[PDB]
Swiss-Prot record, chain C:
The gene is LONP1. The chain holds residues 559 to 608 of 959 of the full protein. Belongs to the peptidase S16 family. The Lon N-terminal domains are crucial for the overall structure of the protein, maintaining it in a conformation allowing its proper functioning. The AP-domain (ATP-binding and proteolytic domains) has a closed-ring conformation in the presence of AMP-PNP and its N-terminal entry gate appears closed. Upon ADP binding, it switches to a lock-washer conformation and its N-terminal gate opens. It is linked to CODAS syndrome: A rare syndrome characterized by the combination of cerebral, ocular, dental, auricular, and skeletal features. These include developmental delay, craniofacial anomalies, cataracts, ptosis, median nasal groove, delayed tooth eruption, hearing loss, short stature, delayed epiphyseal ossification, metaphyseal hip dysplasia, and vertebral coronal clefts. It comes from the Eukaryota. This is Lon protease homolog, mitochondrial. Duodenum, heart, lung and liver, but not thymus. Homohexamer. Organized in a ring with a central cavity. The ATP-binding and proteolytic domains (AP-domain) form a hexameric chamber, while the N-terminal domain is arranged as a trimer of dimers. DNA and RNA binding is stimulated by substrate and inhibited by ATP binding. Interacts with TWNK and mitochondrial DNA polymerase subunit POLG.
Length: 50, 100, 50, 50
């Protein structure tokens, strides 16, 4: 199923970040907002801004 | 080369218009092999172009320097601010302080 | 640049309409009134236009 | 019981407050803001501000 429009976003952004030597400071922020993006409704304005 | 790892600096060319201050920037960028980018500062008043936005606004996008980071994959591009001499400063509150 | 086809009425941006209405891939697009562009919520779109 | 809940968000603040000794004055304002925070539906912009 290619209908997934939530965890697909999670895996895409999580994969894009691997190569960089991320500072832990930003790593915490990106992880938190990933956790917040992964629970939200797909079509709310909050999901698009996130 | 003598002091180990790569490092930044600042410089300021100055001279009569049309003498080639700009072309040497692109040539130096090709010589040192780091990526190039440039943007005017002349006449601007608000700081948002150098400073993005608070992102609770409906239309915000990160300031242009962050776009240049998004394109210039390098974390040490040769930014070239240009024509600071006629920096816009007529608005109340200098953007130039943010530049400093 | 157009919308993300999530928002209401997310029609493609103007260049796509010109590509459709002209029904050929090599129109002579003609920008007009360039002088007073800029100072939007985004600062200006001029970068993308460039 | 298992799985995530809003009270976990309520909790991570509380624990952050548990160590440092706050003045009694601000000990209340945080209390009423917390008690308000649970009752909101999470997608309302009011939840973002609070
Ligand atoms: N030393 C030089 N050798 C070859 N070309 C030159 C030289 N100096 C200037 N030019 C020519 O001038 C053109 C623009 O030069 P440049 O933009 O550096 O002028 P400028 O002094 O930067 O003007 P301004 O500073 O007002 O923007 C280029 O196309 C370049 O080929
Ligand atoms: Mg020049």
């Amino acid at each position: 199923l290619e209908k997934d429009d939530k965890d697909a976003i999670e895996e895409k952004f999580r994969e894009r970040l691997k190569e960089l030597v991320v500072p832990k400071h930003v790593m915490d922020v990106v992880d938190e907002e990933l956790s917040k993006l992964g629970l939200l409704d797909n079509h709310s304005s909050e999901f698009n801004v996130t | 080369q003598l002091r180990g790892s790569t490092q930044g600096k600042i410089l300021c060319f100055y001279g009569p218009p049309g003498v080639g201050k700009t072309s040497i920037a692109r040539s130096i960028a090709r010589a040192l092999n780091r990526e190039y980018f440039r943007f005017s500062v002349g006449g601007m008043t608000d700081v948002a172009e150098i400073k993005g936005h608070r992102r609770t606004y409906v239309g915000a996008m990160p300031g242009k320097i962050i776009q240049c980071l998004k394109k210039t994959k390098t974390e040490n591009p040769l930014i070239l601010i240009d024509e600071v001499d006629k920096i816009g400063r007529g608005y109340q509150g200098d953007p130039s302080s943010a530049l400093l």
